[PDB]
Ligand binder design. Sequence first.
Ligand code: AZA
Ligand code: AZA
Ligand code: AZA
Ligand code: AZA
Ligand code: NA
Ligand code: NA
Ligand code: NA
Ligand code: NA
Ligand code: XE
Ligand code: XE
Ligand code: XE
Ligand code: XE
Lengths: 295, 295, 295, 295
Amino acid sequence: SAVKAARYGKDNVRVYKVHKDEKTGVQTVYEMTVCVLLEGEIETSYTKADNSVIVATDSIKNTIYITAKQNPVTPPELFGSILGTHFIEKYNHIHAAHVNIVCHRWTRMDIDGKPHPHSFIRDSEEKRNVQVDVVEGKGIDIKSSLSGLTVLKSTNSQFWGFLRDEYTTLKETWDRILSTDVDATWQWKNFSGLQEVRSHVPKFDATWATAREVTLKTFAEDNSASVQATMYKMAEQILARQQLIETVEYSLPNKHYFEIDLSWHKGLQNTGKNAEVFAPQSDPNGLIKCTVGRS
Amino acid sequence: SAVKAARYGKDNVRVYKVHKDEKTGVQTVYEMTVCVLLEGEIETSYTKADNSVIVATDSIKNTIYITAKQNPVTPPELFGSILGTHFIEKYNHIHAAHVNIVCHRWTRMDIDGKPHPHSFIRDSEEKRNVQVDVVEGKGIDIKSSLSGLTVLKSTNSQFWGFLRDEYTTLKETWDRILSTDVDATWQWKNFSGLQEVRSHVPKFDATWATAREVTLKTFAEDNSASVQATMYKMAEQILARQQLIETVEYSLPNKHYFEIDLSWHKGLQNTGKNAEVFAPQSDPNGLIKCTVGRS
Amino acid sequence: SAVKAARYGKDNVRVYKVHKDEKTGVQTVYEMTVCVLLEGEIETSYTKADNSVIVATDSIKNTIYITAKQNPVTPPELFGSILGTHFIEKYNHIHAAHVNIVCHRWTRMDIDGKPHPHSFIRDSEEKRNVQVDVVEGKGIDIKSSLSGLTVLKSTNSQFWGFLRDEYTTLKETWDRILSTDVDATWQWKNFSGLQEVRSHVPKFDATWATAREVTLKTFAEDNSASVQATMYKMAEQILARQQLIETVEYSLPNKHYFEIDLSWHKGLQNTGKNAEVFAPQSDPNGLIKCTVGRS
Amino acid sequence: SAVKAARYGKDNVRVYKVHKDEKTGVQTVYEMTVCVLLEGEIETSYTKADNSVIVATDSIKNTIYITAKQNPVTPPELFGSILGTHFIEKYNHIHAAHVNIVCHRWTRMDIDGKPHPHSFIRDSEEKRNVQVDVVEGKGIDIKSSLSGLTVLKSTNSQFWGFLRDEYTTLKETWDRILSTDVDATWQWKNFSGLQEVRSHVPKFDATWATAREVTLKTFAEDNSASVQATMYKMAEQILARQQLIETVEYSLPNKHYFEIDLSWHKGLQNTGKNAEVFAPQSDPNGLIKCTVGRS
Ligand SMILES: O=c1[nH]c(=O)c2nn[nH]c2[nH]1
Ligand SMILES: O=c1[nH]c(=O)c2nn[nH]c2[nH]1
Ligand SMILES: O=c1[nH]c(=O)c2nn[nH]c2[nH]1
Ligand SMILES: O=c1[nH]c(=O)c2nn[nH]c2[nH]1
Ligand code: NA
Ligand code: NA
Ligand code: NA
Ligand code: NA
Ligand SMILES: [Xe]
Ligand SMILES: [Xe]
Ligand SMILES: [Xe]
Ligand SMILES: [Xe]
């Protein structure tokens, strides 16, 4: 037998950082969960019990806190690139670092119509994420994403004209509820190293904001022919607005809400045009994916 | 042996209802999870296998959907009172109904600064809840609550002057992070029945809004001497603003964020006034409760 | 306003303890999650910002580890009684301690038919729990429980003869699946203090084992007329086998498995006597409770 | 823009099947959660709102139940292969099916030392899984796995001789706790189609059993030099015992248990050789992976 692939490191490292403006007294907080996995010339730790090649996972955890102390943690694309670059430059035998960051929302509170200097609210479990792969001699590959964005529209979704055969019971519809949890990922062109990532720093927050805005607007305004058709429209617009993105991937559950026939009870009408009360279904769910790239 | 207490019913009933304004085209959605448990002269179903006394839990589920079809579902205090009253009036041998409702957020989307007529976002896992106990000949007891409201302030929290003995290692502090998930419950004076609940309908949404506003403002503005002292201030204000409330209960975790000493690494300063990077602790957590009532 | 009730302390304290037999080399591990909440003359911490009355929650956490170091942690009824007694005896102004313990399973591995001296497996998320309330001058009240015991029988469950009215759609059945997660609690007679709890130490593990055995046997062997009837039989037997128990409480979900009609597809028969494939339902679920005591 | 990749289908389809032996009266239950995603000539549903190419996800759900009705559901490798083959053969324009199955434990109860004919217990959240990719003209690729197997050993784990630099605080140790949740995957050689999968049916359950047995034995008996070294030993043995496996992958968290220094309290000794009480850490955790293949 032989080691074909190996990676190891520290997962679920929770980090909080505060920035304090001494001039204005305004404080800003960032909270993230970080995972760092390394690859390189480490096979002998598995095959020969040779720990001399292992940067202890506890040391990786220390390094994450030290790096956060000495560098900005925003945008997360920059922080992940700095963190991953550190490991491949510091250790001769480590040749790749894989950094995943989940950013948690701490939104400044408005108290009496004014932004509060040091109080925050978690408005939703929506996350902003990055995956940064730093590979020695191959640059920095970054995938940025938003996840956990849960939306519903109560009309202006349709689904008809699908294949009907002896396995089909679903009725065609011209008016249904559509609800999903949005997972959207945009993949940046490969960067040659940290200097190039630094040169594009303003694009990271702007592109996140654009991806979010396009998702919400398209969902709300599209008279949707299917999840497939609506998600394609989203991906097309994001690619049009940011030339440094190579691909956009969406993964969308179709969270079903079923009509409830109440006609057995005193002829009560609660289907089709009379549908008012529905039963949200926890499972099963449709799952629709697509990756859109350039011609 | 004898049956000392018994209750049974249906839990985790998910319900969605849509309201459509034909004039404006505006749609409004409500989604809830409902539990109904009944009590009464039902001992023989346990002791003698006498199912004749059992209103099937499946029928309870049907009744919830039928009631939602025929009545408003908001405010939830009113809907729960209607639902509970139904069971004690319909069935001679059922003498109490216990209704718990969790309301999920579907907040209307703003697209280009304008409220969208039929698209919604789940902005946070914060819930608005009710517990309604309808007891034949004893009226309607309602407890209203908010839960899952997660907040953090990065300064203006202190904790010093506590008991110090041979079990104590905690250092006094004049500047710490304070973060919690707020669970707040206000208990209404007993209502004689549905007519009285109906007469107070406008107070339910207003009092929820007041409880939320007081919680957020007090948390943000109090230079907190302890969780205990801050929560008391919240409860005091709510009782002052709504005379029909008898008690206010708060249950608050103290979600700890620990300083990280980095001085072992090149004398890096990250404690006390130099603290920038902290480690959020998943467990253990302080848990502080109090119930405040009138003199 | 006035403080009507207050309690505070530390939740989610994870504790592991190992016992090492030096003679045999056999090691035994215990892992628990502990919560301790205190009550007493502590109102002024809420109303006057007087922290002098507060035993810091961090100190409570220390005390839990110190107590586990110096005392056996099994049976959990004994450990909880020792822990709660400590707080009311140590602190003049603390008059009640409320201790909740969840015990996690670490079951010794069998390797080649022989019990291993120091290796363990988590066989199921079933828990053994205690709630211990130690109240100065009122003794020690203990409720013991098992929870998270998930079972299913594929036949020998029936449900017919229930109330049928205009809200009823459920068909009577003489053969259905019955599946539940068992939550069972037995409440001990009040103990005068630690000496009396110590005198009954052997009864705690034996009664847990009896409660588990009776639950499993009765579930498997009863030709069940309803959840209600089967659970009563369980509670009756436990009370008969242990005179120091005053009440037994069961709380059982009815986790539904629905038939799937496949007759629309080539006349496929999958209902009633031909039912083979079913759809487990995640929600809603029946919920049935009862508390059984002595005549 | 262009569609670079697309797949869609139904996730979280819960299925239960019962087998009844009419001779012996013994019943056997199987419960699974199934996901099926399809690929093929479906781009136009995304780009042109052409639903004619879509096999509705609701129809996929129907097909899963119908297939379970007409075929054995065990071993899951066989069931997944049948299910995936169905879609690529039935639909001209569908060219790949991706089937994921999670099998849930329902273990027959022993009542009074005898196996019960129709009563079952969920002994642990450990799963047996398969991933089956059926690609037209490229055969059937199957990855089998076990996951959620949680183990702990209280001694006979060491970790010393790792890289020490200015980021390192971890002390070397010759005696520590080791606990993990095992995720192990074995990848079968490519099969040409259903006939070949059928010819190897007995190997699937046997290899699962071998993988489980090797994992448990090696974990319990290895005087572990690191997670890396122990996991390699496991993978090596599995490959030696089943020639039709090409690779074995393990992904293991290192779930840390920290010593608690209690010396500040009356010189209490609870570290090194005197360590009895430990603090399980919920996060962060080490994460160690490796893929082992043949020379
Ligand atoms: O087994 C281990 N492997 C590792 O890589 C490691 N790093 N810290 N502790 C560790 N333990
Ligand atoms: O055992 C049962 N008890 C009940 O009360 C019930 N209601 N519907 N199905 C049921 N099954
Ligand atoms: O606000 C607090 N209240 C408390 O009771 C406590 N105990 N430790 N830290 C604390 N902080
Ligand atoms: O938008 C949808 N896309 C689909 O593929 C599908 N299948 N059933 N319902 C559906 N809705
Ligand atoms: Na390197
Ligand atoms: Na009544
Ligand atoms: Na006392
Ligand atoms: Na095909
Ligand atoms: Xe969508
Ligand atoms: Xe607070
Ligand atoms: Xe039961
Ligand atoms: Xe391991």
